[PDB]
Structures are given as structure tokens and as C-alpha cells.
Amino acid sequence: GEWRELRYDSTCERLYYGDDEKYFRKPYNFLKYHFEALADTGISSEFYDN
């Protein structure tokens, strides 16, 4: 999922994502690498005055 880092080409005036390495090999001992994306951010605030 990280195939969007950066790449520039001055001679061609071309700006695009680096297309060199987009593949991940899975060893035999690994079932699946489960490329996904989740995010849960929660802030808690408590202000009491007596």
C-alpha cells in the first residue's frame, strides 16, 4: 500500500509515484500479510471543579 512515496524526472519533466519496487514476498512460515488499513483515534477529557 506504500506505492505512492515519490519520484521525479528532470529530463522529461515527469512527476509520478516511484514504480521501482511494488511487491512483497511472503515466506513459507507466514499465512497471509493481510494488507488493510484501520484507524481509531480517541481522546478523553475530564475537567471537574469543586
- C-beta of 32: minimal distance to other proteins in Å? 17
Q: Using the rule CB under 8 A, is 21 a contact of other proteins? A: no
d(CA 29, CA 40): 30
Q: Which stretch binds other proteins (CB under 8 A): 7-15, 21-29, 37-45?
A: 37-45
The reply on whether position 2 binds other proteins by CB under 8 A is: yes
Rounded Cα distance between 33 and 24, Å, is: 9
Tell me the C-alpha distance between 6 and 14, whole Å. 11
Residues near other proteins (CB under 8 A)? 1-2, 4, 36-50
